[PDB]
Structure formats: C-alpha cells, structure tokens
Amino acid sequence: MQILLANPRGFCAGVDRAISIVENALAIYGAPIYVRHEVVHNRYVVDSLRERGAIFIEQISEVPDGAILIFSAHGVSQAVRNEAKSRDLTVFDATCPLVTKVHMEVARASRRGEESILIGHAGHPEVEGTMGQYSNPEGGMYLVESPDDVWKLTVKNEEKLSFMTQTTLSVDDTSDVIDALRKRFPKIVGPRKDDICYATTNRQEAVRALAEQAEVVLVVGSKNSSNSNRLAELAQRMGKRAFLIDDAKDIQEEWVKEVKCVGVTAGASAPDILVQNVVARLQQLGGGEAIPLEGREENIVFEVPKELR
Ligand SMILES: CC#CCOP(=O)(O)OP(=O)(O)O
Ligand code: SF4
C-alpha cells in the first residue's frame, strides 16, 4: 500500500506561536499557568501542557487572583478581556495575529455604529471572540453560517453593512455564503474574498490534491478542530472515505484493508509527531515509505512576544 503525505499539513504560524507562548510562560514562571480555553484544539497538545502544569479553564472566574493567564490562539471577547483586566491577573495573549486582524475590523465597524455580519460556526471560540468585539447598541452584529441564514436575515440599515469571516472555514462553502450576502445586500463591504487564513486555504488545496490520488484520507486532528474537520469533509465530498483521528491508536484496520493508496494530512493544530506515529502504524498495516506530495511552500512565522523570549 502506498502512503502519500499532503503538503502543506500540520502546524500553522499562529498555532506554533501560541504553544510556544504557554511553554515559555511555564519555563519562565513555573506551574501553574492558567489558559483560557484549549490553547489550540488538539488533545495531545493540551494534555502535554496540562502534564507540565498548564491549567485550562473556560471562565475567568475559575482563575485565582495573582495568577498568570494566557488567552488561547482563537482569541477572546472584549468582555472576557475586560474581566481579566478588572481582576488581579498577569495576562499574555496568544491570539493569532490573523484573528486579531478580523477583530480590528469588527471594532472599527462598532465605533462607526455600522452593522456587521460574521460568517462562522455558532459556539466556536473564535466566533465568540470576534462577535465579542462589537459593542455599539446602535449598530448590530449578526452571525450567519449558510446561505439559508443570509436569506432569513434582516438588518437595520443595509446601505451601511460590512462582513467578516472566521479564519478556519471551508473556502468553497464560505464563497457560497458571500455570494448570497452580495445578492441579498448589494452595498455590503468586505475583504476581496474572505478572512480565511493562508494556512486554512493552503491545507484545503493540499488535501484536494491528496484526495485526487488517495482512496482513503486520514486527517490528524481533534474532533473540535474546525480546520481539521474541513479537511476531512473536503475529501469526503470528493467521494473518498476520510477519517478524523487523534492519533495512530484510532486507525481501524478495516479502513485500509485492500487499499492501494492511503493519504495522510494534519490540521493546523496537530503536531508532526502524531503524523509520524500514524505513518508508523500504516506501515505495520502494509504501507511502504511515506511519500510527500509537492506543495505550496509556506514561509510565515509569528514570533512570541518579547516579554516571553
Ligand atoms: C486559533 C487557531 C487555530 C487553528 O487550529 P485549531 O485550534 O484546531 O482551531 P480551529 O478549531 O479554528 O480550526
Ligand atoms: S489557522 Fe490561521 S488564523 Fe488560525 S492560528 Fe493558524 S495561521 Fe492563525
């Protein structure tokens, strides 16, 4: 059985930065370091940091006075930031710079009292954080997930309306939402295409290329990782069996029995050691040397804040 690896796969710049922010905090200050939300949506990363003394919480009321608190890479609402600010807390922010870019646009619209529409998935932490930058009661902030949602939306003033997107969506499904937004609201203002980041765009392109060759695609990523779920979904819609897996223990032999070509990729929150162990397991199940596919080269790095070198 041939093993193909998607390219690019695995860690993006925001996820490597966020992990480094928590590890460096641990190394500088010792345990415990409190983290608001999973720093990134990967069970192995989160367990690793927990075993080293990071304590992951959902609400600032779970953090003691005097504690060091880190915001996860997905970002936080103004209310959460204000709650940490009004408390005794030393705060480091691991929000990806490409999520903060979206937050600044929502802040701008809020200050103008002009309504905004975010395209994104209800209850995802990034959507909570981004919706949470809008505070002006005179404007409005609305979430849509599908064209049907756009067809039911009514707003106060459609001549002054802008849109933003979550960073880890399906490029194709988002494009259909934006097409609806523009038909429904011809004066709506947005970015040229969406706020989907380079890493999400690039890993979707890479898994498309992988699924063209492979019969079965394994995506290394946790169940609550939006971008990892989008890679599996993309492969499934191309008619390949695709499985979202945390690690090699998840691989069921039946999924690859009699399969001549198996493809592996990884979401932007999955460490390469997990892919290495997946490949080892596929080799126990008959696979040969893993062959990386040619891919678009990535070169962006985001540095940790100077305070945490
Ligand atoms: C912030 C961020 C990021 C990329 O990985 P993730 O943590 O799995 O996040 P998503 O659930 O948004 O995909
Ligand atoms: S998936 Fe994109 S926006 Fe999210 S942390 Fe990675 S680089 Fe930043």
Side-chain angles (χ1 to χ4, degrees), residues 12 14-15 18 38-42 72-75 94-96 99 124-126 166-168 200 222 224-229 267-270:
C12 58
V15 159
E38 289 188 347
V39 54
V40 298
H41 293 150
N42 187 81
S72 79
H74 316 96
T95 303
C96 176
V99 174
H124 187 283
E126 187 189 322
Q166 180 180 327
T167 54
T168 47
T200 297
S222 294
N224 65 344
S225 166
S226 171
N227 82 85
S228 301
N229 276 96
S269 45

PDB file of all heavy atoms in Angstrom, residues 12 14-15 18 38-42 72-75 94-96 99 124-126 166-168 200 222 224-229 267-270, ligand 1:
ATOM      1  N   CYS A  12       0.367  25.569  11.681  1.00  0.00           N
ATOM      2  CA  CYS A  12       0.479  26.897  11.066  1.00  0.00           C
ATOM      3  C   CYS A  12       1.297  27.818  11.982  1.00  0.00           C
ATOM      4  O   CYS A  12       1.734  27.449  13.117  1.00  0.00           O
ATOM      5  CB  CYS A  12      -0.964  27.521  10.951  1.00  0.00           C
ATOM      6  SG  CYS A  12      -1.719  27.631  12.570  1.00  0.00           S
ATOM      7  N   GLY A  14       0.318  30.574  13.623  1.00  0.00           N
ATOM      8  CA  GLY A  14      -0.367  31.076  14.846  1.00  0.00           C
ATOM      9  C   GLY A  14      -0.352  30.005  15.921  1.00  0.00           C
ATOM     10  O   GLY A  14      -0.191  30.328  17.125  1.00  0.00           O
ATOM     11  N   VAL A  15      -0.476  28.749  15.490  1.00  0.00           N
ATOM     12  CA  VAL A  15      -0.548  27.610  16.460  1.00  0.00           C
ATOM     13  C   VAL A  15       0.888  27.419  17.051  1.00  0.00           C
ATOM     14  O   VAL A  15       1.073  27.266  18.258  1.00  0.00           O
ATOM     15  CB  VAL A  15      -0.996  26.295  15.772  1.00  0.00           C
ATOM     16  CG1 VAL A  15      -0.573  25.083  16.599  1.00  0.00           C
ATOM     17  CG2 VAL A  15      -2.521  26.320  15.608  1.00  0.00           C
ATOM     18  N   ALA A  18       1.365  30.178  19.595  1.00  0.00           N
ATOM     19  CA  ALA A  18       0.531  30.069  20.800  1.00  0.00           C
ATOM     20  C   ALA A  18       1.124  28.997  21.750  1.00  0.00           C
ATOM     21  O   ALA A  18       1.112  29.190  22.970  1.00  0.00           O
ATOM     22  CB  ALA A  18      -0.922  29.784  20.435  1.00  0.00           C
ATOM     23  N   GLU A  38      -8.782  25.614  25.595  1.00  0.00           N
ATOM     24  CA  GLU A  38      -7.684  24.894  24.917  1.00  0.00           C
ATOM     25  C   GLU A  38      -6.825  25.868  24.097  1.00  0.00           C
ATOM     26  O   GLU A  38      -7.387  26.625  23.284  1.00  0.00           O
ATOM     27  CB  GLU A  38      -8.240  23.808  24.044  1.00  0.00           C
ATOM     28  CG  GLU A  38      -8.811  22.647  24.852  1.00  0.00           C
ATOM     29  CD  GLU A  38      -9.208  21.430  24.024  1.00  0.00           C
ATOM     30  OE1 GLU A  38      -9.301  21.471  22.835  1.00  0.00           O
ATOM     31  OE2 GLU A  38      -9.529  20.372  24.585  1.00  0.00           O
ATOM     32  N   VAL A  39      -5.480  25.838  24.300  1.00  0.00           N
ATOM     33  CA  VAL A  39      -4.660  26.890  23.678  1.00  0.00           C
ATOM     34  C   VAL A  39      -4.854  26.787  22.148  1.00  0.00           C
ATOM     35  O   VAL A  39      -4.930  27.809  21.432  1.00  0.00           O
ATOM     36  CB  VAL A  39      -3.177  26.818  24.086  1.00  0.00           C
ATOM     37  CG1 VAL A  39      -2.576  25.401  23.800  1.00  0.00           C
ATOM     38  CG2 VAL A  39      -2.397  27.885  23.308  1.00  0.00           C
ATOM     39  N   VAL A  40      -4.941  25.539  21.675  1.00  0.00           N
ATOM     40  CA  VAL A  40      -5.319  25.214  20.255  1.00  0.00           C
ATOM     41  C   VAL A  40      -6.126  23.944  20.420  1.00  0.00           C
ATOM     42  O   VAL A  40      -6.035  23.251  21.498  1.00  0.00           O
ATOM     43  CB  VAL A  40      -4.063  24.910  19.345  1.00  0.00           C
ATOM     44  CG1 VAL A  40      -3.100  26.169  19.243  1.00  0.00           C
ATOM     45  CG2 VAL A  40      -3.316  23.640  19.799  1.00  0.00           C
ATOM     46  N   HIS A  41      -6.926  23.625  19.420  1.00  0.00           N
ATOM     47  CA  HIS A  41      -7.830  22.423  19.549  1.00  0.00           C
ATOM     48  C   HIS A  41      -7.142  21.124  19.173  1.00  0.00           C
ATOM     49  O   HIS A  41      -7.425  20.531  18.095  1.00  0.00           O
ATOM     50  CB  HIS A  41      -9.060  22.679  18.624  1.00  0.00           C
ATOM     51  CG  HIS A  41      -9.902  23.793  19.087  1.00  0.00           C
ATOM     52  ND1 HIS A  41     -10.624  24.585  18.250  1.00  0.00           N
ATOM     53  CD2 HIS A  41     -10.235  24.181  20.401  1.00  0.00           C
ATOM     54  CE1 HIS A  41     -11.321  25.482  18.958  1.00  0.00           C
ATOM     55  NE2 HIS A  41     -11.120  25.218  20.287  1.00  0.00           N
ATOM     56  N   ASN A  42      -6.185  20.696  20.020  1.00  0.00           N
ATOM     57  CA  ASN A  42      -5.526  19.405  19.852  1.00  0.00           C
ATOM     58  C   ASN A  42      -5.332  18.787  21.233  1.00  0.00           C
ATOM     59  O   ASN A  42      -4.656  19.309  22.140  1.00  0.00           O
ATOM     60  CB  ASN A  42      -4.184  19.569  19.096  1.00  0.00           C
ATOM     61  CG  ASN A  42      -3.591  18.226  18.762  1.00  0.00           C
ATOM     62  OD1 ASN A  42      -3.985  17.555  17.771  1.00  0.00           O
ATOM     63  ND2 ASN A  42      -2.779  17.753  19.657  1.00  0.00           N
ATOM     64  N   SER A  72      -6.279  31.902  24.649  1.00  0.00           N
ATOM     65  CA  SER A  72      -5.934  30.891  23.610  1.00  0.00           C
ATOM     66  C   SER A  72      -5.747  31.551  22.256  1.00  0.00           C
ATOM     67  O   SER A  72      -6.145  32.706  22.045  1.00  0.00           O
ATOM     68  CB  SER A  72      -6.994  29.789  23.493  1.00  0.00           C
ATOM     69  OG  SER A  72      -8.156  30.221  22.728  1.00  0.00           O
ATOM     70  N   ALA A  73      -5.244  30.793  21.289  1.00  0.00           N
ATOM     71  CA  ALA A  73      -4.967  31.312  19.938  1.00  0.00           C
ATOM     72  C   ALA A  73      -6.234  31.773  19.216  1.00  0.00           C
ATOM     73  O   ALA A  73      -6.165  32.570  18.286  1.00  0.00           O
ATOM     74  CB  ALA A  73      -4.275  30.241  19.119  1.00  0.00           C
ATOM     75  N   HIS A  74      -7.409  31.283  19.644  1.00  0.00           N
ATOM     76  CA  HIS A  74      -8.664  31.627  18.952  1.00  0.00           C
ATOM     77  C   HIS A  74      -9.191  32.974  19.286  1.00  0.00           C
ATOM     78  O   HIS A  74     -10.064  33.480  18.585  1.00  0.00           O
ATOM     79  CB  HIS A  74      -9.759  30.605  19.358  1.00  0.00           C
ATOM     80  CG  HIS A  74      -9.234  29.226  19.342  1.00  0.00           C
ATOM     81  ND1 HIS A  74      -8.772  28.617  20.470  1.00  0.00           N
ATOM     82  CD2 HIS A  74      -9.045  28.360  18.316  1.00  0.00           C
ATOM     83  CE1 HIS A  74      -8.305  27.430  20.161  1.00  0.00           C
ATOM     84  NE2 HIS A  74      -8.430  27.272  18.832  1.00  0.00           N
ATOM     85  N   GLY A  75      -8.592  33.579  20.317  1.00  0.00           N
ATOM     86  CA  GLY A  75      -8.974  34.986  20.749  1.00  0.00           C
ATOM     87  C   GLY A  75     -10.122  35.044  21.769  1.00  0.00           C
ATOM     88  O   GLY A  75     -10.767  34.046  22.039  1.00  0.00           O
ATOM     89  N   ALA A  94      -2.250  34.877  23.519  1.00  0.00           N
ATOM     90  CA  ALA A  94      -1.726  34.071  22.395  1.00  0.00           C
ATOM     91  C   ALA A  94      -2.621  34.126  21.166  1.00  0.00           C
ATOM     92  O   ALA A  94      -2.388  33.363  20.226  1.00  0.00           O
ATOM     93  CB  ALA A  94      -1.512  32.596  22.873  1.00  0.00           C
ATOM     94  N   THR A  95      -3.604  35.079  21.081  1.00  0.00           N
ATOM     95  CA  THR A  95      -4.459  35.183  19.906  1.00  0.00           C
ATOM     96  C   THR A  95      -3.629  35.257  18.614  1.00  0.00           C
ATOM     97  O   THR A  95      -2.648  36.069  18.560  1.00  0.00           O
ATOM     98  CB  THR A  95      -5.336  36.465  19.990  1.00  0.00           C
ATOM     99  OG1 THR A  95      -6.087  36.407  21.201  1.00  0.00           O
ATOM    100  CG2 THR A  95      -6.359  36.510  18.833  1.00  0.00           C
ATOM    101  N   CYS A  96      -3.988  34.472  17.578  1.00  0.00           N
ATOM    102  CA  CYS A  96      -3.200  34.531  16.325  1.00  0.00           C
ATOM    103  C   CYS A  96      -3.332  35.998  15.795  1.00  0.00           C
ATOM    104  O   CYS A  96      -4.459  36.599  15.762  1.00  0.00           O
ATOM    105  CB  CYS A  96      -3.710  33.465  15.315  1.00  0.00           C
ATOM    106  SG  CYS A  96      -2.798  33.661  13.776  1.00  0.00           S
ATOM    107  N   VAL A  99      -6.296  36.296  13.482  1.00  0.00           N
ATOM    108  CA  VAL A  99      -7.601  36.516  14.159  1.00  0.00           C
ATOM    109  C   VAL A  99      -7.727  37.953  14.647  1.00  0.00           C
ATOM    110  O   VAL A  99      -8.787  38.633  14.435  1.00  0.00           O
ATOM    111  CB  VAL A  99      -7.740  35.512  15.310  1.00  0.00           C
ATOM    112  CG1 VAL A  99      -9.007  35.798  16.125  1.00  0.00           C
ATOM    113  CG2 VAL A  99      -7.801  34.092  14.740  1.00  0.00           C
ATOM    114  N   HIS A 124     -18.284  28.337  18.254  1.00  0.00           N
ATOM    115  CA  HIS A 124     -16.843  28.190  18.164  1.00  0.00           C
ATOM    116  C   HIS A 124     -16.155  29.327  18.912  1.00  0.00           C
ATOM    117  O   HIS A 124     -16.649  30.451  18.892  1.00  0.00           O
ATOM    118  CB  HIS A 124     -16.458  28.214  16.664  1.00  0.00           C
ATOM    119  CG  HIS A 124     -15.032  27.910  16.425  1.00  0.00           C
ATOM    120  ND1 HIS A 124     -14.021  28.817  16.631  1.00  0.00           N
ATOM    121  CD2 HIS A 124     -14.426  26.738  15.987  1.00  0.00           C
ATOM    122  CE1 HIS A 124     -12.841  28.255  16.316  1.00  0.00           C
ATOM    123  NE2 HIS A 124     -13.077  26.969  15.952  1.00  0.00           N
ATOM    124  N   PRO A 125     -15.047  29.081  19.623  1.00  0.00           N
ATOM    125  CA  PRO A 125     -14.469  30.180  20.411  1.00  0.00           C
ATOM    126  C   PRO A 125     -14.031  31.383  19.563  1.00  0.00           C
ATOM    127  O   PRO A 125     -14.098  32.519  20.054  1.00  0.00           O
ATOM    128  CB  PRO A 125     -13.193  29.597  21.033  1.00  0.00           C
ATOM    129  CG  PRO A 125     -12.865  28.380  20.156  1.00  0.00           C
ATOM    130  CD  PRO A 125     -14.238  27.843  19.722  1.00  0.00           C
ATOM    131  N   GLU A 126     -13.575  31.165  18.320  1.00  0.00           N
ATOM    132  CA  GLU A 126     -13.181  32.305  17.540  1.00  0.00           C
ATOM    133  C   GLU A 126     -14.384  33.179  17.240  1.00  0.00           C
ATOM    134  O   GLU A 126     -14.267  34.398  17.237  1.00  0.00           O
ATOM    135  CB  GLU A 126     -12.537  31.871  16.223  1.00  0.00           C
ATOM    136  CG  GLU A 126     -11.940  33.057  15.449  1.00  0.00           C
ATOM    137  CD  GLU A 126     -11.480  32.701  14.022  1.00  0.00           C
ATOM    138  OE1 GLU A 126     -10.932  31.594  13.814  1.00  0.00           O
ATOM    139  OE2 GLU A 126     -11.652  33.538  13.096  1.00  0.00           O
ATOM    140  N   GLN A 166     -14.799  33.913   9.964  1.00  0.00           N
ATOM    141  CA  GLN A 166     -13.872  33.094  10.752  1.00  0.00           C
ATOM    142  C   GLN A 166     -12.742  32.608   9.851  1.00  0.00           C
ATOM    143  O   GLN A 166     -12.884  32.436   8.633  1.00  0.00           O
ATOM    144  CB  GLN A 166     -14.700  31.874  11.221  1.00  0.00           C
ATOM    145  CG  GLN A 166     -14.004  30.822  12.089  1.00  0.00           C
ATOM    146  CD  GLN A 166     -14.938  29.692  12.457  1.00  0.00           C
ATOM    147  OE1 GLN A 166     -16.183  29.871  12.640  1.00  0.00           O
ATOM    148  NE2 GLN A 166     -14.364  28.493  12.561  1.00  0.00           N
ATOM    149  N   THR A 167     -11.602  32.332  10.515  1.00  0.00           N
ATOM    150  CA  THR A 167     -10.362  32.097   9.771  1.00  0.00           C
ATOM    151  C   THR A 167     -10.240  30.670   9.265  1.00  0.00           C
ATOM    152  O   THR A 167      -9.505  30.430   8.368  1.00  0.00           O
ATOM    153  CB  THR A 167      -9.089  32.369  10.606  1.00  0.00           C
ATOM    154  OG1 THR A 167      -9.163  31.597  11.836  1.00  0.00           O
ATOM    155  CG2 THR A 167      -9.037  33.873  10.955  1.00  0.00           C
ATOM    156  N   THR A 168     -10.973  29.716   9.855  1.00  0.00           N
ATOM    157  CA  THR A 168     -10.758  28.282   9.628  1.00  0.00           C
ATOM    158  C   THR A 168     -11.977  27.617   8.982  1.00  0.00           C
ATOM    159  O   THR A 168     -12.258  26.420   9.273  1.00  0.00           O
ATOM    160  CB  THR A 168     -10.458  27.558  11.009  1.00  0.00           C
ATOM    161  OG1 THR A 168     -11.434  27.981  11.990  1.00  0.00           O
ATOM    162  CG2 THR A 168      -9.095  28.004  11.516  1.00  0.00           C
ATOM    163  N   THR A 200      -5.352  27.825   6.320  1.00  0.00           N
ATOM    164  CA  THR A 200      -6.615  27.057   6.056  1.00  0.00           C
ATOM    165  C   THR A 200      -6.753  26.899   4.541  1.00  0.00           C
ATOM    166  O   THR A 200      -7.031  25.803   4.035  1.00  0.00           O
ATOM    167  CB  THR A 200      -7.779  27.864   6.607  1.00  0.00           C
ATOM    168  OG1 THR A 200      -7.597  27.986   8.054  1.00  0.00           O
ATOM    169  CG2 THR A 200      -9.097  27.185   6.366  1.00  0.00           C
ATOM    170  N   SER A 222      -8.037  16.919  16.191  1.00  0.00           N
ATOM    171  CA  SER A 222      -9.052  16.636  17.225  1.00  0.00           C
ATOM    172  C   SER A 222     -10.496  16.914  16.764  1.00  0.00           C
ATOM    173  O   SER A 222     -10.723  17.670  15.842  1.00  0.00           O
ATOM    174  CB  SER A 222      -8.721  17.426  18.497  1.00  0.00           C
ATOM    175  OG  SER A 222      -7.480  16.940  19.056  1.00  0.00           O
ATOM    176  N   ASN A 224     -12.853  18.744  17.852  1.00  0.00           N
ATOM    177  CA  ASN A 224     -13.289  20.111  17.993  1.00  0.00           C
ATOM    178  C   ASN A 224     -12.436  21.087  17.211  1.00  0.00           C
ATOM    179  O   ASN A 224     -12.532  22.357  17.389  1.00  0.00           O
ATOM    180  CB  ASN A 224     -13.349  20.520  19.468  1.00  0.00           C
ATOM    181  CG  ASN A 224     -11.935  20.544  20.187  1.00  0.00           C
ATOM    182  OD1 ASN A 224     -10.954  19.976  19.689  1.00  0.00           O
ATOM    183  ND2 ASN A 224     -11.832  21.278  21.318  1.00  0.00           N
ATOM    184  N   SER A 225     -11.587  20.534  16.325  1.00  0.00           N
ATOM    185  CA  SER A 225     -10.782  21.473  15.451  1.00  0.00           C
ATOM    186  C   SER A 225     -11.557  21.776  14.164  1.00  0.00           C
ATOM    187  O   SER A 225     -11.774  20.860  13.359  1.00  0.00           O
ATOM    188  CB  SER A 225      -9.455  20.858  15.122  1.00  0.00           C
ATOM    189  OG  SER A 225      -8.807  21.563  14.039  1.00  0.00           O
ATOM    190  N   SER A 226     -12.048  23.001  14.018  1.00  0.00           N
ATOM    191  CA  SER A 226     -12.752  23.335  12.816  1.00  0.00           C
ATOM    192  C   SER A 226     -11.912  23.056  11.540  1.00  0.00           C
ATOM    193  O   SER A 226     -12.423  22.406  10.605  1.00  0.00           O
ATOM    194  CB  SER A 226     -13.187  24.834  12.901  1.00  0.00           C
ATOM    195  OG  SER A 226     -13.699  25.198  11.583  1.00  0.00           O
ATOM    196  N   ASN A 227     -10.692  23.595  11.485  1.00  0.00           N
ATOM    197  CA  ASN A 227      -9.977  23.492  10.216  1.00  0.00           C
ATOM    198  C   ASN A 227      -9.720  21.961   9.931  1.00  0.00           C
ATOM    199  O   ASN A 227      -9.693  21.563   8.727  1.00  0.00           O
ATOM    200  CB  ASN A 227      -8.676  24.347  10.342  1.00  0.00           C
ATOM    201  CG  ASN A 227      -7.531  23.564  11.063  1.00  0.00           C
ATOM    202  OD1 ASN A 227      -6.763  22.792  10.461  1.00  0.00           O
ATOM    203  ND2 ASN A 227      -7.422  23.772  12.335  1.00  0.00           N
ATOM    204  N   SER A 228      -9.499  21.107  10.957  1.00  0.00           N
ATOM    205  CA  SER A 228      -9.208  19.686  10.659  1.00  0.00           C
ATOM    206  C   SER A 228     -10.478  18.982  10.112  1.00  0.00           C
ATOM    207  O   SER A 228     -10.394  18.246   9.141  1.00  0.00           O
ATOM    208  CB  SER A 228      -8.779  18.977  11.938  1.00  0.00           C
ATOM    209  OG  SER A 228      -7.659  19.550  12.521  1.00  0.00           O
ATOM    210  N   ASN A 229     -11.636  19.347  10.644  1.00  0.00           N
ATOM    211  CA  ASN A 229     -12.896  18.838  10.191  1.00  0.00           C
ATOM    212  C   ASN A 229     -13.132  19.265   8.727  1.00  0.00           C
ATOM    213  O   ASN A 229     -13.610  18.468   7.936  1.00  0.00           O
ATOM    214  CB  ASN A 229     -14.083  19.307  11.046  1.00  0.00           C
ATOM    215  CG  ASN A 229     -14.297  18.451  12.280  1.00  0.00           C
ATOM    216  OD1 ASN A 229     -13.829  18.781  13.406  1.00  0.00           O
ATOM    217  ND2 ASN A 229     -15.067  17.421  12.118  1.00  0.00           N
ATOM    218  N   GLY A 267      -4.360  18.688  10.507  1.00  0.00           N
ATOM    219  CA  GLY A 267      -4.881  20.059  10.687  1.00  0.00           C
ATOM    220  C   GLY A 267      -3.779  21.001  11.201  1.00  0.00           C
ATOM    221  O   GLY A 267      -2.681  20.544  11.646  1.00  0.00           O
ATOM    222  N   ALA A 268      -4.126  22.287  11.260  1.00  0.00           N
ATOM    223  CA  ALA A 268      -3.123  23.297  11.635  1.00  0.00           C
ATOM    224  C   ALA A 268      -2.759  23.245  13.130  1.00  0.00           C
ATOM    225  O   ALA A 268      -1.763  23.855  13.530  1.00  0.00           O
ATOM    226  CB  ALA A 268      -3.695  24.713  11.316  1.00  0.00           C
ATOM    227  N   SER A 269      -3.554  22.499  13.927  1.00  0.00           N
ATOM    228  CA  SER A 269      -3.261  22.373  15.396  1.00  0.00           C
ATOM    229  C   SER A 269      -2.593  21.012  15.777  1.00  0.00           C
ATOM    230  O   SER A 269      -2.352  20.783  16.992  1.00  0.00           O
ATOM    231  CB  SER A 269      -4.617  22.570  16.143  1.00  0.00           C
ATOM    232  OG  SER A 269      -5.617  21.819  15.500  1.00  0.00           O
ATOM    233  N   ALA A 270      -2.273  20.177  14.755  1.00  0.00           N
ATOM    234  CA  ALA A 270      -1.733  18.802  15.036  1.00  0.00           C
ATOM    235  C   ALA A 270      -0.216  18.733  14.898  1.00  0.00           C
ATOM    236  O   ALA A 270       0.289  18.943  13.781  1.00  0.00           O
ATOM    237  CB  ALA A 270      -2.384  17.811  14.035  1.00  0.00           C
TER     238      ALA A 270
HETATM  239  C1  LIG B   1      -6.582  29.773  16.671  1.00  0.00           C
HETATM  240  C2  LIG B   1      -6.401  28.620  15.813  1.00  0.00           C
HETATM  241  C3  LIG B   1      -6.230  27.651  15.050  1.00  0.00           C
HETATM  242  C4  LIG B   1      -6.033  26.527  14.126  1.00  0.00           C
HETATM  243  O1  LIG B   1      -6.376  25.255  14.845  1.00  0.00           O
HETATM  244  P1  LIG B   1      -7.485  24.907  15.859  1.00  0.00           P
HETATM  245  O2  LIG B   1      -7.017  25.257  17.171  1.00  0.00           O
HETATM  246  O3  LIG B   1      -7.810  23.478  15.573  1.00  0.00           O
HETATM  247  O4  LIG B   1      -8.676  25.895  15.573  1.00  0.00           O
HETATM  248  P2  LIG B   1      -9.977  25.811  14.717  1.00  0.00           P
HETATM  249  O5  LIG B   1     -10.954  25.000  15.582  1.00  0.00           O
HETATM  250  O6  LIG B   1     -10.497  27.177  14.468  1.00  0.00           O
HETATM  251  O7  LIG B   1      -9.636  25.118  13.476  1.00  0.00           O
END
